[PDB]
Amino acid sequence: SAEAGITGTWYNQSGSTFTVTAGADGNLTGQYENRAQGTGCQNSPYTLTGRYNGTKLEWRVEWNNSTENCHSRTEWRGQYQGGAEARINTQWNLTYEGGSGPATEQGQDTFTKVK
Ligand SMILES: O=C(CCCC[C@@H]1SC[C@@H]2NC(=O)N[C@@H]21)N[C@H]1CCNC1
């Protein structure tokens, strides 16, 4: 249980932010705001849901809200590092229906509580 430490506002290297509540039971809930240049569904909140087990975290965002539907979703999997300069290091998949078949994009996001 990395509850009090995970809970808060985070920023990745693309300038995207999420705000999350980590319950004692391991529920992750909150909102994600994408600001990655050239992508869809930016600058409005999307629902974040996921699960954590100690330092091990996973959450997903469906890119559909009352503002914009990008017919896609992302899952993040990684580890929380507490203490001075606390970090969430993640691998993500961004999946959607491509022209020929199911698409997957892959990347790494590094999250800090520094704005
Ligand atoms: O472009 C999108 C939806 C927005 C994706 C934002 C990505 S998720 C991983 C990375 N981290 C972050 O903070 N922002 C980016 N969806 C569709 C449009 C057409 N094909 C994918």
Author numbering: 23 to 137
What text appears in the publication on this structure?
Tetrameric streptavidin (T-Sav) has been popularly used, engineered and evolved for hosting reactions that are mediated by biotin-appended chemical catalysts. We have recently reported an organocatalytic 1,4 conjugate addition of nitromethane to cinnamaldehydes within a protein environment through adaptation of the streptavidin–biotin technology. In this system, biotin was covalently modified with pyrrolidine groups, resulting in ligands 1 and 2 which differ by one stereocenter. Here, we performed mechanistic investigations on how a protein host affects iminium catalysis.
The monomeric variant M-Sav was tested as an alternative host for iminium catalysis. Although it lacks the subunit interface and shares moderate sequence identity with T-Sav (55%), M-Sav has high affinity to biotin (KD = 2.8 nM). Catalysis by 2 in M-Sav was mildly improved (20% 1,4-addition product, entry 2) but there remained a substantial amount of the 1,2-addition side product (7%). The melting temperature of M-Sav increased significantly when ligand 1 or 2 was included (+20 °C) as assessed by circular dichroism spectroscopy, implying its binding to the biotinylated catalysts. We began by testing the monomeric M-Sav as the host; the reaction lacks both enantio- and regioselectivity despite numerous optimization attempts, and protein X-ray crystallography analysis revealed that the catalyst is solvent exposed. Tyr111 in M-Sav : 2 is a relatively bulky residue located in proximity to the secondary amine motif and corresponds to Ser112 in T-Sav : 2. Replacing Tyr111 with other residues including serine, threonine, valine, lysine and alanine did not improve the conversion or the regioselectivity (entries 3–7). Glu120 in M-Sav : 2 is in proximity and spatially corresponds to Leu124 in T-Sav : 2. Though modifying Glu120 slightly improved the overall yield of the 1,4-addition product, the enantioselectivity of the catalysis remained low (entry 8). In contrast, the monomeric M-Sav contains a solvent-exposed site and was found to be a poor host for iminium catalysis.
